[PDB]
Amino acid sequence: PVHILAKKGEVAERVLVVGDPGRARLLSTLLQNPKLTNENRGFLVYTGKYNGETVSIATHGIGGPSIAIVLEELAMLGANVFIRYGTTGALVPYINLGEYIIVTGASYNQGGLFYQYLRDNACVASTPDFELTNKLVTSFSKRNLKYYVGNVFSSDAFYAEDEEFVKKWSSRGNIAVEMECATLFTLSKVKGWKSATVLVVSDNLAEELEKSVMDGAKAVLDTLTS
Amino acid sequence: PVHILAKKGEVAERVLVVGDPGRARLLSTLLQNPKLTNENRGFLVYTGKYNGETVSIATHGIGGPSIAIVLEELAMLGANVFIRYGTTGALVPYINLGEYIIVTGASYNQGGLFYQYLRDNACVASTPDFELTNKLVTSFSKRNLKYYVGNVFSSDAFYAEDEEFVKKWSSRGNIAVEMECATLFTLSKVKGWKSATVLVVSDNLAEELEKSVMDGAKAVLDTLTS
Amino acid sequence: PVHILAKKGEVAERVLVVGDPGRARLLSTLLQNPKLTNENRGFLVYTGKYNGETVSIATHGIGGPSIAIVLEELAMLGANVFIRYGTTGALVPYINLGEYIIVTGASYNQGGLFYQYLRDNACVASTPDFELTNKLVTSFSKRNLKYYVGNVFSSDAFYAEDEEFVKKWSSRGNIAVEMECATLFTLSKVKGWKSATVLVVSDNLAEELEKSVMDGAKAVLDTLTS
Amino acid sequence: PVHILAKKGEVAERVLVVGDPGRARLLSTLLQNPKLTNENRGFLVYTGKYNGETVSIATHGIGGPSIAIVLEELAMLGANVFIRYGTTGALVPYINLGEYIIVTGASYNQGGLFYQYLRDNACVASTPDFELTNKLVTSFSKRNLKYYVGNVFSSDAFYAEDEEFVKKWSSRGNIAVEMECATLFTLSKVKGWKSATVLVVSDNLAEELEKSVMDGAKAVLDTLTS
Amino acid sequence: PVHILAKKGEVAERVLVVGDPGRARLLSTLLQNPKLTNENRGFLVYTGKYNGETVSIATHGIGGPSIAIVLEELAMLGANVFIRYGTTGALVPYINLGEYIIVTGASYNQGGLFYQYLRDNACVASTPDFELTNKLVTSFSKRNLKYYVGNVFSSDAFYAEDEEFVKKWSSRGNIAVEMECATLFTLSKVKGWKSATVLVVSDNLAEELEKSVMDGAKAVLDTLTS
Amino acid sequence: PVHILAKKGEVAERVLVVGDPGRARLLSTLLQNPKLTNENRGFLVYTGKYNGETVSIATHGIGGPSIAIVLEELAMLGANVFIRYGTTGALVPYINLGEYIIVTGASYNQGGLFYQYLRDNACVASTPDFELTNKLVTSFSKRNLKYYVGNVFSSDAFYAEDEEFVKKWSSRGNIAVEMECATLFTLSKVKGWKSATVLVVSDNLAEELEKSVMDGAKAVLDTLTS
Numbered sequence A, B, C, D, E, F: 001p002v003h004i005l006a007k008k009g010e011v012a013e014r015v016l017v018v019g020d021p022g023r024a025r026l027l028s029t030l031l032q033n034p035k036l037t038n039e040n041r042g043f044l045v046y047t048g049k050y051n052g053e054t055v056s057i058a059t060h061g062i063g064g065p066s067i068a069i070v071l072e073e074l075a076m077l078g079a080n081v082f083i084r085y086g087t088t089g090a091l092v093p094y095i096n097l098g099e100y101i102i103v104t105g106a107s108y109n110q111g112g113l114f115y116q117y118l119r120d121n122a123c124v125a126s127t128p129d130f131e132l133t134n135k136l137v138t139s140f141s142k143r144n145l146k147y148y149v150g151n152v153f154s155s156d157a158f159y160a161e162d163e164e165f166v167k168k169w170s171s172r173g174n175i176a177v178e179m180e181c182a183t184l185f186t187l188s189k190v191k192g193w194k195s196a197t198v199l200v201v202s203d204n205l206a207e208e209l210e211k212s213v214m215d216g217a218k219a220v221l222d223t224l225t226s
């Protein structure tokens, strides 16, 4: 690995992955005896214990290209179970800020990264691990957290203009927009890793937030160690 | 409606859809007082009772174009819940003939039918209803049936050659091949229908068959009338 | 073959193919000593004689994927000359219901089936056999039937919405819309089969029918046996 | 028009188009009272009479973009019937040099010119006018000339390397390769022009020529004026 | 070589390429003892002296397919440095007729010629030789000529309609439109040739022309013989 | 802006952009009185003076999606001149480690980000600002630094397998591989920003390094303030 410099045996098999370096640090606090195993290129990685299991929390940055690099190197260091925990913008009216979205699949525009990895333009089913996702539902339900289950659109361009954006994607079965689930799910299927995702609704395109992010992390950590 | 000439209030809200008219007929013998509500163009549709609830069994033929038409017409006729039940070819070594596969997503090559409906070549997530699918898993498990859960490749060409066929699609996270799940799933997300799929393995690319079919149908019907 | 279970030696080299099973049964009365050689999956196939020659009438269902399978298997059973007879929707105002359209080519949206068979997205000329097509023109002329000669658009989505459908395809040299000639013409070119198509206009998007359907059928049988 | 600067009334409705300027000059001697109506950009255009009708012979250069411009402008000058006469490379072993190929359709790789004109990547049937094409067959038959009828591949890159060129295009129903009929057929279908093509086999990729070229030309002129 | 029939040692290493045979001839009067080394298919090529150095002026016709063939054959005949010199249509308001544009890159629609050469649809950078281009800027500046530097769109369809044409390509960083720079630049990068382009503005989409052409040619020739 | 929280009037019009957060900090040391204006999400941004001009050094992370977000927000805060300074892997043998590459254009696979921003799949010329790039050449030459001028390939997948990678891209006119130049150049052309790039060769796919990175930064800063 040339980006994540952690030592082999310093990254757990179970990994909670977030996009924001600051969130990684904030959440490392939920682990027992956390140790910073990497800071190179800004990708903060912490390793500690939880519910009697070793777990790592890693930063993946923004976008398909970035998370692909991070996931590939973590895997080379021993990780094989990944749970994405990030933020998202809801595409439907009935979902409120601070509530969660457990992802069942990801829509995406083809090309680039997908072409290079897949070899052609086939629309390969971009979905998470079935078993793991149900465990997420079970952990969020037990902690009495308000969530919804559905697909999301993994955009590559945050600021690209598209006047019919919300209508187009929501009419396509997607309930929220984010940027790296398609890459995670598809690469995981190709490489044989077990993956899933839960998102915190931070905006609706159709201190209370800190609480929401903290509560969701506990459910995810519970899942990762179940 | 110019293909399925059924009268008003003759098609149930819940529908078990199969590709072979032969199976539609055979399976209708599991209902209470089955009536043939359509035979036009060979698309057999039966409506009767099961566990006290009204339900229908319909023929969709082979291919995306065929099942799209049948689904659109049944929907106009009042249907909104669909569970496809057919046969598939495994793409992995460990699955035996007669066992079952509960579909979690569908891979496909873009163009044609998808382009006309979606209006562009975006890879929209082609997945079943989360809830309904979990119900199928429970039904099949309750009846002690052997099943696997995963994605499948929806092919458009039964006889097209591909020397790398099996390793290609199996390395892409697909455990079996069939021909209409992608159409069913995508159109359902767009139209707002609740769909799922269960397949009977009739061959593995990597009397006893009618019994396997019979047992699985009972589990599916328990789910539609649950 | 796994769909059409007729015994080799039960399928004629000359085949008239129709999408509707009902039409196959009705047109079999035009043959001498008709015999049912297959009913599996609703794909009715009748074989008999017509003016000194053995001829078969087969059902192909709806859509490219369906007719592809049927065509492949009939060929494996000995067929090499196919003339499709079906219904179509006129795209130009001057054509009346009941009249016929003798097809000279097919336009199609690429992808799926064509990609699997051709292996890339090249627009391979989808045309019928030149000779066989002129023989059809002669037969229809001999029976004093009104017809037009032109290209058609082979759609995959009967119900997909397109606010500019008629103008778009008519301005592209097409005079009618159907769903399987492009698959028929292309696969025939690749496999070495001799194929052609005549359609009955059942509606214009821009008793009488029975007789129309019957007269046309006689014209097709003459062509196949001259 | 900015390329062909002939005065309207100097271009016949009936036009025989050839890629080579030299060929245009040589074939003009076949007309009665030939007059040079344009030489701008090397696009030689001659107009005269042939068996009771006014006819023009025009140069179209090499490639789809070139012939597109020339065809558009000749039309703006009054032309509506185009018959291209050129050279071609046979893709099947049985065709000999000097023989002719009467084109029934054109295969092409999509993009560029087709995308700008059609506005998307649909594979619009690229075929000639059915009637005009049969008239050519009749003329060549009347002069006892040896010909074959079939599809051709319209290439854009004469020198691009493809180790499986012959096998690929021949297995796709094409019997020869050229460079501009696809552009000719498609634009004619969209613009409402009546077009056709006959080619002289100058080589097989799988004195005698002069006379071949001359006899064929007489056959084309008869067709254009009958 | 079957298009340009020049003898050995008749084509110079440096070549000024223009699309119009008329200009090739006219421009050859700026050379010392010009000789016509090819007229086949209308592709005029002259070779003579300028500022003591041997150089050639060649006709490439219209369109990517045409210029690709001419460039490949001149290269086989010994040429390896190419400077295209032609006319263009400005896409911005501030550029006046008669002024010049030194090309820094070329935009284009994929497919056709590019697919056959590149073997896939990757957007390969279509740019001129850095060094040669800087030399043109210096030559033109030394001769006090008014020029602009920027990218251009290489169209394949002079007459295709596009109501958003100007704002589309101008908003994409292109300041003018022509038809062969993309082919010239891309093929040069692939074959290892040194190319550049200078265009004379003959119209703006947002006697005195032959003088503008004459002045610019001198600057180009100074560059080729520099 | 929601990622870069700097205040308006806290980001300069001239910006040196690097991918690595650590490099940003390392280089801020070359500025007079540097001030950290942003740390959110790990995107370090410093603002200070150099050669009598205000300049900012900003972190862009890895990949097209990431840099697009950063560039768009910096622009909203007042930046309009960007010079990319990163690392790259050489695709040609003759380029040594620690030497530099001044970029003249970027090759890229289409789709995703480009599709969303461009609206279709046109291969838009992805090039830097002409004037700015020449100034880079002038600054590196004056500091006696060894550099090469050429195009690069902007990959989206660092670890995707491609056995013919070096040959394919180098034969396409690219001398090095990196990941965000295509996005920078194209977005800059669309938005009207002035951009350029210089890369430090850290690997060749065909303390001394610290010195190399430091020396190159001085040349870039000289350019940005010239």
Ligand SMILES: O=c1[nH]cnc2c([C@@H]3O[C@H](CO)[C@@H](O)[C@H]3O)n[nH]c12
Pocket: A019, A061, A062, A063, A086, A087, A088, A089, A090, A177, A178, A179, A180, A202, A203, F003
């Ligand atoms: O519209 C949106 N709203 C809220 N969050 C996001 C996000 C996620 O948050 C990050 C933006 O900083 C991205 O990496 C992405 O995963 N994407 N799109 C949206």
Ligand SMILES: O=c1[nH]cnc2c([C@@H]3O[C@H](CO)[C@@H](O)[C@H]3O)n[nH]c12
Pocket: B019, B061, B062, B063, B086, B087, B088, B089, B090, B158, B177, B178, B179, B180, B202, B203
């Ligand atoms: O490889 C295979 N094996 C077994 N069954 C199928 C099937 C399904 O069976 C039907 C006929 O083969 C199709 O409509 C399809 O859904 N497809 N592909 C395969």
Ligand SMILES: O=c1[nH]cnc2c([C@@H]3O[C@H](CO)[C@@H](O)[C@H]3O)n[nH]c12
Pocket: C019, C061, C062, C063, C086, C087, C088, C089, C090, C177, C178, C179, C180, C202, C203
């Ligand atoms: O618009 C239309 N009008 C009339 N007939 C058809 C048909 C044909 O009839 C069947 C569906 O009604 C298809 O298999 C097709 O061949 N398709 N589209 C049309």
Ligand SMILES: O=c1[nH]cnc2c([C@@H]3O[C@H](CO)[C@@H](O)[C@H]3O)n[nH]c12
Pocket: D019, D061, D062, D063, D086, D087, D088, D089, D090, D177, D178, D179, D180, D202, D203
């Ligand atoms: O392989 C070939 N053999 C013979 N003639 C041609 C031609 C025709 O001749 C010209 C180039 O020699 C083109 O304009 C084209 O129409 N193209 N390709 C071939």
Ligand SMILES: O=c1[nH]cnc2c([C@@H]3O[C@H](CO)[C@@H](O)[C@H]3O)n[nH]c12
Pocket: E019, E061, E062, E063, E086, E087, E088, E089, E090, E158, E177, E178, E179, E180, E202, E203
């Ligand atoms: O819009 C335009 N205006 C002026 N000249 C051209 C040209 C160039 O002039 C030739 C004929 O129009 C072409 O080969 C092309 O290179 N293309 N497009 C335009």
Ligand SMILES: O=c1[nH]cnc2c([C@@H]3O[C@H](CO)[C@@H](O)[C@H]3O)n[nH]c12
Pocket: A003, F019, F061, F062, F063, F086, F087, F088, F089, F090, F177, F178, F179, F180, F202, F203
């Ligand atoms: O093959 C390579 N070698 C050296 N550097 C790079 C880089 C650049 O370095 C970063 C990797 O950390 C990427 O953001 C990219 O711009 N990409 N590809 C290569």
